[PDB]
Amino acid sequence: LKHENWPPPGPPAVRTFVSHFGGRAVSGHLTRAAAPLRTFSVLEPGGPGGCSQKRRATVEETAQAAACRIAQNGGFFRMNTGECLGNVVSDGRRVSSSGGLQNAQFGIRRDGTLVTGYLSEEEVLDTENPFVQLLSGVVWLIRNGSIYINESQATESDETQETGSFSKFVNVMSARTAIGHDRDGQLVLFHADGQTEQRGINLWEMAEFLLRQGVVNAINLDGGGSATFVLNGTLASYPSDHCQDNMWRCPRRVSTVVCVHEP
Amino acid sequence: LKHENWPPPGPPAVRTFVSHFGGRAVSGHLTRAAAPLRTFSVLEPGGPGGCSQKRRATVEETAQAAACRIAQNGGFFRMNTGECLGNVVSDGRRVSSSGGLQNAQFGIRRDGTLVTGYLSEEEVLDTENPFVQLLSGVVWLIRNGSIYINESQATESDETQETGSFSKFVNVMSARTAIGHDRDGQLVLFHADGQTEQRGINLWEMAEFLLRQGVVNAINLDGGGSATFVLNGTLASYPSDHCQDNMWRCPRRVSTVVCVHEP
Ligand SMILES: O=P(O)(O)OC[C@H]1O[C@H](O)[C@@H](O)[C@@H](O)[C@@H]1O
Ligand SMILES: O=P(O)(O)OC[C@H]1O[C@H](O)[C@@H](O)[C@@H](O)[C@@H]1O
Ligand SMILES: CC(=O)N[C@@H]1[C@@H](O)[C@H](O)[C@@H](CO)O[C@@H]1O
Ligand SMILES: CC(=O)N[C@@H]1[C@@H](O)[C@H](O)[C@@H](CO)O[C@@H]1O
Numbered sequence A, B: 001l002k003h004e005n006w007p008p009p010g011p012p013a014v015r016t017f018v019s020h021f022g023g024r025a026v027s028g029h030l031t032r033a034a035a036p037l038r039t040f041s042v043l044e045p046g047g048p049g050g051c052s053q054k055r056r057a058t059v060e061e062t063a064q065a066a067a068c069r070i071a072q073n074g075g076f077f078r079m080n081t082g083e084c085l086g087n088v089v090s091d092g093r094r095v096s097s098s099g100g101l102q103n104a105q106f107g108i109r110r111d112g113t114l115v116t117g118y119l120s121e122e123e124v125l126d127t128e129n130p131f132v133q134l135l136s137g138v139v140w141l142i143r144n145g146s147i148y149i150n151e152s153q154a155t156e157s158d159e160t161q162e163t164g165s166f167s168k169f170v171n172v173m174s175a176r177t178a179i180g181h182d183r184d185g186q187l188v189l190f191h192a193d194g195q196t197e198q199r200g201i202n203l204w205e206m207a208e209f210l211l212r213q214g215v216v217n218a219i220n221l222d223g224g225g226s227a228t229f230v231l232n233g234t235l236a237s238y239p240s241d242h243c244q245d246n247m248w249r250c251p252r253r254v255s256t257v258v259c260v261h262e263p
Helices: A059-066 A121-125 A149-155 A166-171 A203-212 B059-066 B121-125 B151-153 B165-170 B203-211
Strands: A003-006 A013-021 A024-033 A039-043 A072-073 A087-091 A095-096 A103-111 A114-117 A131-136 A140-143 A177-181 A187-192 A215-221 A229-231 A257-260 B003-008 B015-019 B024-033 B041-044 B070-073 B088-090 B094-098 B105-109 B114-117 B132-137 B139-141 B176-182 B187-192 B213-220 B229-231 B257-260
Touching: A003 A215, A013 A203, A024 B229, A039 A087, A059 A072, A059 A229, A059 A257, A072 A177, A072 A187, A087 B229, A095 A257, A103 A215, A114 A140, A114 A215, A114 B151, A121 B094, A140 A149, A140 A177, A140 A203, A149 A166, A149 A203, A166 A203, A177 A203, A187 A203, A187 A215, A187 A257, A203 A215, A203 B094, B003 B213, B015 B151, B015 B203, B041 B059, B041 B088, B041 B132, B041 B139, B059 B070, B059 B139, B059 B229, B059 B257, B070 B176, B105 B213, B114 B139, B114 B176, B114 B213, B139 B151, B139 B176, B139 B203, B151 B203, B165 B203, B176 B203, B187 B203
Parallel strands: none
Antiparallel strands: A003 A114, A013 A024, A024 A187, A039 A257, A072 A229, A072 A257, A087 A095, A087 A131, A103 A114, A103 A131, A140 A215, A177 A187, A177 A215, B003 B114, B015 B024, B024 B187, B041 B257, B070 B229, B070 B257, B088 B094, B088 B132, B105 B114, B105 B132, B139 B213, B176 B187, B176 B213
């Protein structure tokens, strides 16, 4: 009712793009990975226990301990405290709660079922077919093959992102990332390089792009300076944050990470 | 007095930028590596013997065989035949000739002397202090701390690059790459993502950027679709060529490669 369940039924395919959104050229990658139950992980910052310690680490640091073939930044977090925000299940271990808020979620149950959308506390704690991986974003981009941004603005909590108003967060140009799946049950990761209010895409544009790629459900993960794409442990994107006291670009220390590893 | 000699004076510094050239945001990397006599190699495509066999291989393929920490596409080539163009010396092995043409060159001799500029056949074939690495480009960007593109346009042969007229090659927007060195004798590698006549920079813009980073000599290497940046064997740039029959971007099979590796 409030979420989509996809029953469960080959190295990941990493695609590089430079595409035009509203006339602007935006670079990024689309990753497609089969057998998510075997290859998909949600990782805590700096290894197990990171969310409890409120640790912040770069996607590179977190991914290299896990030997991820493809890693991207994960959920939203409080920059000043390192608190993980939203429900998180990391390799069977629940390490973050929604705190009453309703936000877009994506995860996989123990039998391989992919779940996307708004989950109650009871659904998250279900011991029957428990979640093995789960994280929260902000805005349910695609529901059952249709854009669901209008509905997200109407119903989703707006206490997690710090970009500004919900409308600005939805419509501003920025770096963006998203997670979802296609109709064959393959995991889909997306990222686009950008910089808030300067370069990149908004959520309407990302949702259209993903529908073209066959995505049937997907949520928006952390963007802006948090957006990071790490390929075999190497940074392969252009972060927007500047390094300290110079104008070079530097990857942000973030919280949870989404990982695709070998089965 | 047609070339410059720089006497021999930590891991390499890899920096990411997104920088603005006339209001266009251009992304790329600047690499700086010490002790080039021990850490810098020019590689033949695929493996040793690539030039004699007219091999074309991606920078990734060529670099994974050499264990490069940083790799970029090298000199110019003929796409239809795979012929290596210009003088090439790869770890002491001479594998390509100038054919009488005059083009910007960059090399290091056995004692560590860094050499940039125009070289006679006698200088290339010298055996007293022989070249251990050497490759040729098109346009001498910076000579002893001053831009030298006007002089290069005045003197360099124009039979190697296939972009079009000399003026277009210099002034057109595109993906670009460059090799040079700073006054501490360190190797500098530069690349900017782009697409000929759509995105990127021209040679004047790249030359101005390199001067601000302390580059005292540099030449222009193969740009356009050839431009590739590979870090620890993983592609970390956005090539402009499309893959066969789809919207995704694919690295180009190129010729010689410039490599920074362990000493
Ligand atoms: O991640 P974004 O969208 O680029 O925002 C990053 C910026 O947000 C606000 O301006 C501040 O909190 C700054 O710390 C930061 O420069
Ligand atoms: O490396 P570049 O600059 O992108 O050039 C690639 C292009 O060169 C030529 O002009 C044409 O044959 C094009 O069809 C080709 O795609
Ligand atoms: C465009 C975008 O998503 N920016 C996000 C912001 O919303 C979020 O509050 C913060 C920490 O999670 O990271 C980034 O700044
Ligand atoms: C703008 C630019 O660098 N273009 C080059 C072209 O000049 C060269 O002829 C070809 C093969 O080396 O590769 C790229 O297309």
